[PDB]
Amino acid sequence: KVFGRCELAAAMKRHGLDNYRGYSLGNWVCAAKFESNFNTQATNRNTDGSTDYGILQINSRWWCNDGRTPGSRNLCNIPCSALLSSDITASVNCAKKIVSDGNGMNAWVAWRNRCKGTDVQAWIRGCRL
Template identity: 50%
Template sequence: MLKLQLLVLVPVFWAVAQGSVFERCQWARLLKSRGMDQYQKISLADWVCLTRWESSFNTRAVNHNRDNSTDYGIFQINSKWWCRDSGPSRANGCNINCSALLADDPTVAINCAKTVARQQGAKAWVAWKVHCQGKDVSQYIAGCGLDLSDSASNFL
């Protein structure tokens, strides 16, 4: 059993160490290992859908907004509310510097996304509302060797 777990986890850790753009199934397995399946009643498939449309699974994605705020990382977390950068900020809900969201290791980004989800749910992400909400998102984790019964979609 330990060998099987290592075979599943080694590619995930290798992806974290080697680059900033995840392959869909590697990302899904990593999110599952970090407790994101059904986190705040948001399915794993919804998390993968959300990050696909927000950043194309790129931990270094950066997008500048019209209000002079910036969205950072794989979850595109906004500087106005959730992290601190040199731009306008009303809050630092995750108590981090925005640059921490750009690390190849997505631990800080995942923890901050959990904070956002606890306070606002998946509706905090525009891409989720447009591309994932109310849709069959099972294809985002299909073929990844994950138990689909643990990741039923669209709880919001």
């Protein structure tokens, strides 16, 4: 599913991500924009053989199981395929664990490089939320 911008912001709010660990909804929408362009089916293979899955491009080295990442963990306790669903529940639940892990949203390199410090409220501007 490719979400619309306001559509995703609404779904993220519905699942409790808005201001989670102090990161406003616009942070989360911005991160999703640059990680997946709002496409739940986005996948990206990394040089280390791990893969990133879903709207927030959650990586298989720590967070989900894909059966093909040697030495990895599955801290969210889910198949990485669950991260590709049209229903963002699994992605949101796993993102909450990832953002709680110590470096906040810096866990998402793209958030650091493209969202951090910017006018992230632009990402929710105009939306009925």
